[PDB]
Amino acid sequence: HWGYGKHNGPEHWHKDFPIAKGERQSPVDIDTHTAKYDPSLKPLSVSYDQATSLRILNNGHAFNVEFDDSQDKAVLKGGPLDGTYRLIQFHFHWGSLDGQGSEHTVDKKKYAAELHLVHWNTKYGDFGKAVQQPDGLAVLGIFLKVGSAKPGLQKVVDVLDSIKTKGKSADFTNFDPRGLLPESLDYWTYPGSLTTPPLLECVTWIVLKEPISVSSEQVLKFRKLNFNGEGEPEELMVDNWRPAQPLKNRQIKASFK
Template identity: 70%
Template structure:
């Protein structure tokens, strides 16, 4: 828990259990390092990206690193080092695919708390349509390295208020 966000970091035991991203606007293989959500105090200022000037209540970032580099840290400092998939969340119907993530909130209600998260497929967090916008940019949090190929999905996923 990071007070305004929380992050789930993948522990890579071997290449077979680590989700990867290939194709689309990127070349090579990118391994999932972590995902996190950004949200705000109100429904009109949670996402970090906008569409036609409008923000979503929340935005999910799935952070991947280019496996041609030996580590996430080294990849993050390279122009082609990271690929981040952004997914908007909208307030709507309950989303059973998010339930395992939401259930984890109970054990990480305060800053610095951690929990173990096993047997989870991050693909369940993606919408049905994988249409996207893409651009080369930077991390949205310090150190703001300009090493990110952004892939922002056009279709949001829903989450209920409760």
């Protein structure tokens, strides 16, 4: 099955998921000089005050912090978006080394990791229906660099030992995703895809310009996770990122000058 090894990594995915070679695949390189300011964007609205986290799951390719998405509790609106998008989960992609790990790049620069806050358009009723639509999802992407600790990340880091291996979950209530955001909401946006199989072309990407800083120790804890299940050969969950895909007939827009 697909993964991030030599034998089953991104360069193989097209065999089972031909949309891997599609017209609007993600991630992409963000060429900051060619992105264009778009006056027509609306201000981004990130409304996370009423968020209800539920659980954290090691799904074998990342860990997802899952939310109650049965009401409009944690929603994204504005920016390029029409309508209301509900937070369903967030997860990260990260490297084996601090010099790689992000999926998007900025002028070819790779960050140590990238946070994806995944939201679905409430007009489509559930996530599964939303991923079948061209405007089904909105994913807020945030780069991570290594420097100072991120205090709002620590609660995530410290539960990771309980979900070391694929298929493990743990209760994860009362986590506040506001503690993962940078100061600025300036962003780039473009139409793209899921970055994991099934690679569906259903995402409006909103990638923040300002990275967050995490500590060495925090990223090192990400790197102790396992891709494998308990009782299978240990394979560290590292380098779980898809590289940049061709931009094709897309323009990246900026919210800022």
